[model samples]
Target chain A: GMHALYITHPQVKIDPAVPVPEWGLSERGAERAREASRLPWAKALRRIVSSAETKAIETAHMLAETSGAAIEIIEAMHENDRSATGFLPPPEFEKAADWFFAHPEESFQGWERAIDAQARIVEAVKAVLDRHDARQPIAFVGHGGVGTLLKCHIEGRGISRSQPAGGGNLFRFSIAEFSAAATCDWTAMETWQG
Target chain B: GMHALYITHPQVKIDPAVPVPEWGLSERGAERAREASRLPWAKALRRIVSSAETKAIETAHMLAETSGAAIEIIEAMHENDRSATGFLPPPEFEKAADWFFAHPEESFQGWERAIDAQARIVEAVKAVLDRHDARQPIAFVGHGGVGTLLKCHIEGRGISRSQPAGGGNLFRFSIAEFSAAATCDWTAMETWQG
Candidate 1:
């Protein structure tokens, strides 16, 4: 059964806060968010799930309100960690960037490692599936990294080693089957399900 | 007048079988969560506000059970925005790290800008505060970023523009008095009176 609607919006807002955590949606973001609330599938959504970030939750809440569903936030579904506490500023950041690109295989580093982030997100998604009817589609609102990582994982790609892309992208994966240890092949969207 | 208790915790465990939004606390997280229900302030709380994250709500729910406070999940109180779809892989994530270090002015950048993150957090905090008792402290269960930004705003510092040594660490801030706009000076931790 097609149990989940993997959605993303190009209009998702980029917050101004630095170091990967404190940004919010722009004015235009609000309009797109409202527009998202009108989607047909949104009416069918049983649970509204989002990262613990303003933009994602705000977006999800709009839909939840429209759908008359309550929202649940998941921290593991948060974007990859980017802070290294007090230390060198720009130069260190640049070096970190260079290192990330150079060592794609060891992509996960610093405070929140890639492998750890991926596992957490995967588990978070699974938790949502457990609570509701798998036959009914569920909504997971989160950042680009977590969404993409989940996609890559379901598709059997090495997400930790993949190159990153810009935001506002959503992919849908269909779990044809599942085992105690794993989920089967997933279908992705070139665009969002909206 | 303190109407609610906002509890904070380290991390949450995600369940692999359910959808991301339906995930719950891990065994270890649940253990620590039990302590929240027994806080002295728990009895006085009339509401339980959370960012809607699994960990936050999971923690809040425990507190709610003990206090018998109604839970309200607010999207605006979310931690911060990180990615477009909320995914932040290593290679692309480095750009965020770089932006943080380069933008010392603490102003808006591209996506997830600092100022915007702070603004949203401020809005949420103020809304929560207005509904609760000014004399009683309201507990806000959120992430490090939202907590930090709210503290900065209450202290009259432009979150992104001002560099505070305590950046993302969490504790508490009490509203001393309201000013012309929405600004207020907080009672420093050392000066806090219960």
Candidate 2:
């Protein structure tokens, strides 16, 4: 009876010196978040659920500020654990990401296995959803890795990052049943009007 | 905003003398239909859409009569075009049915192609959904073959008869976006409480 949006925080600042989890949103990403918050559906959000990471929290704040919604930060909703490898360049990161999904049961370079991340993300999302109060609009903002994993679970499909191509991606769904798939594919946050 | 149920008719009379398309519900099937009509969810139906076949129509009528809903007869919603081969015994029919789904693009002994049946059932359901006016409960009654095809489409899975092994089956879903999946599994019509 309610609608919800799963939003992956857009571009990050990409600092080599800063820890990966501590990297905040780029100015372009912040601008996109502001524009997305102004969209019709985004403006109706009654709750803005976010990952504890800086970039995700920043994006969630932008939407929450404009929509007058309460904000909730859940540490478990953060991106897949990659602290084992600290940080990798874009080319190496992309390869690792591909392998992360390709073998869900196995850890990539000692990072958290895709299967474990999917389970954590799903449990985190479901916990918040099950406790939600009413026919309200809510947004969950996080990273693309665990978000794509959650989408695969919701859609009843196998893990495949090929199915989701980029950042700023979001999918809209209702909170009636956790098993139901999101009717919308992962769309650009700035472009999805409703 | 509205919830809907897709129900496949239960056991039929299975008269060897009668045409397959003209076969009506058996005594047990009728009793099950009566039991289903009294379920809490069935009491809320505002509309009942039925296939052209006698069994599905009779089942829909039983539910509609008790729920005080309008009955719609959609010929396009009938079971896959198996009239090409008339009637076959259970063993022969079962084998052909398996082949029908296994090779969706090909016909089984001149029966309607599984791919084509999936298309027809999806289009028929969408046509009614597009015209539906209110946020009320609606029931779609049809045979298991086409119903399973429609469910496969809804869940975004490929054709598979192994999943839904029997009749008197139903799945509850909301009437928001055509692409979302039913959170519930294919359930027995007589047992689902909500």
Candidate 3:
């Protein structure tokens, strides 16, 4: 009965001139987030753990509106350290993401090394998981890069951008050993049920 | 959007007096499985790919009653070959199972080698997966030994009986690439929904 859902915030406004993390959810993103809130699992949430990023926070707020769960912000749960290159054009970001995963030991254009980010997300998640009540349903709202890293750790696989396409995808895992605790994939938020 | 569920039959009659594969489902097992038939995924099944074993066959039949899906018996989907020692007592079976996993390349008491069994289930499941229509949701009913082995291959991990505590467990995965496709555990059949 113990379970945790690691959810990646969906679409967000892309302000190449503005800083990344501060960008909020797009109308499309907010619409789906609202739709996701109506799902069975969203309504059952006892608590929502979210990254401090504005996008994740926004998504978390929408889920809380439905689940009635208060959101707890975890600053360390932020996306992969891409401060080295604040914002890049879409094509550039895609190319860089490939390198980010392919070279785990090396930084991609000074972005956090894949290995370091994986460890960071893994530890950050475990810390929360270790303290949480096993009986309560919970969710961790965050970005996809770090969310994928966390997922890689749970599945005990090497890192890659193998995460599902788009935002608002989630994967469930055990509160105990955290294997593929469920036989599930990175399901679209709106499609998954309790 | 495509998914597959690998469901292992629940408890079975302990018939050391009869051949193991021929033993039917226990009363408790049939009870829970009937309850599982009311589950959302159960009724949605377009097909049920089941092993030749009695227990799994019985489960597939029960699921079909609700889903209206035709059962396709795959003899290769049967549990690991333990014909070497027909059946053992519970305690002996437990000890032998441990060794069976720990020494995957070797057989215990003349059982099929774990490595061999893993390959067998992996190929058998893939054969079905490769031919099935992706748009149709499907279920595979079989034994835990081979089910867990197939799981190990999907998780891309070494063989171990890290399966759940009991039977009637189901794990969901992608019909395309078969990654954890969904973040789920080997959940009890009755507990999961679409």
Candidate 4:
């Protein structure tokens, strides 16, 4: 049975002074990842892949450390490009997120359209699976935005931001059928079944 | 600002012999609920509501114990009518779930149609919010199937199985706008910003 786990990194140190992509996991976020790594699912993981972003990579490292797996960086797995407007405060970001999900085909201030981001994430996950071994369960750590996009695609639904919020949440799906098998908070790593 | 948290009950004692609706939380599930109640958000909850199902009520009780919030039972918040099949083994249940999400308009083996469940859950949540104070954060503990359905409505998305997996996962939305603000594993209550 082929299975994959898609996990969004937990809380990040949101710093407007720093580039968004470069922002790493906050102290609590790192602690959460470490705690997640101790779960049975993390130990069961044979391989871990992550977006090139600092936070995802950091999160992946925790799993790799626990599972003795190697980390593979896939730039394509990065979050939807939101660099056009840089970082907006929480309220502003929330408004932009509403528009982002509402209008999949259109861009907000040159940010990646939901449709395009969905397409990219789906393709990237597919490409990774094609190259990886199917015998063992694998984890792909990334951002909430693209993770939700990939999830919508896998579920045969349109792009929507109805995904687990914050960081460090995950959903499990079969690689062969590409249907969601389970969804759980990242903290409860062992709760997920593949 | 009023925010609402929709949380599915923690893992239940899966007993095929027992009536599905009567099955309560497993020991692990209860522990999980107790752990969840310790989260800062649980203490912040001003109101609590749950499905009449034993598991949902049990999950709500843990939060109520911690937050000193009363549990209001809403029979309409029950899980989608899987009573038709009762308890299918995991494999069979997975297959049925696939069909359920894929063909929202059709009932699989007399089970509740995904569309109908979505409509009922959305209406129930709306009704609860309409009668409650909109000034505080509230928590609604229920089942995953209907929670996903309600989430779809909140996000302006169609019925899809693109929601958190496992028991005790939740998503936050504004009661005023009914838009998903965040999604988190129930364990990370403090992480969600509503």
> Which is the leading candidate under DockQ?
1
- Candidate 2, position B155, lDDT: 78
Sort every candidate by lDDT, greatest first: 3, 2, 4, 1
Cα lDDT over the full model 4: 0.73
Model 4, C-alpha of A156: deviation from truth (Å) = 0.9
What C-alpha lDDT, on a 0 to 100 scale, does residue A131 get in candidate 2? 91
Angstrom error at residue B87, model 3? 63
TM-score of each: 0.42, 0.47, 0.47, 0.47
Root-mean-square deviation of candidate 3:
22.6
State the local distance difference test value for candidate 1. 0.54
How many backbone collisions does model 2 have?
A: 0
lDDT of 2 by residue, B1-194 (tens): 27678898876664322443566777877888888998888888888999987988889987765788889999999878765553232323455667788889987656789999999999999999989976767889987778889878887788988524447888877677564654478888888888
- Segments of candidate 4 deviating more than 4 angstroms: A14-20, A179-194, B1-194
lDDT of 1 by residue, B1-194 (tens): 53322344434443222344444555655654555456555555566678876767776777566778767789887655643424443443454545553453454334465567777877776777776755544566666555656656565655532212311113445444321223222222212233
- How displaced is residue B110 in candidate 2, in Å? 1.5
Model 1, A94: alpha-carbon shift in Å? 8.7
lDDT per residue as tens, model 1, A117-180: 6777788877766666656567777765556567666766665433123333444455443212
Worst ten in a row by lDDT for model 2 chain A: A86-95
- Ten-residue region with minimum lDDT total, candidate 3 chain B: B86-95
Docking class of 4: incorrect
Please give me the DockQ of candidate 3 compared with the native complex.
0.01
Residue B127 of model 2: what lDDT?
94
Q: How far is candidate 2 from the true structure (C-alpha RMSD, Å)?
A: 21.8
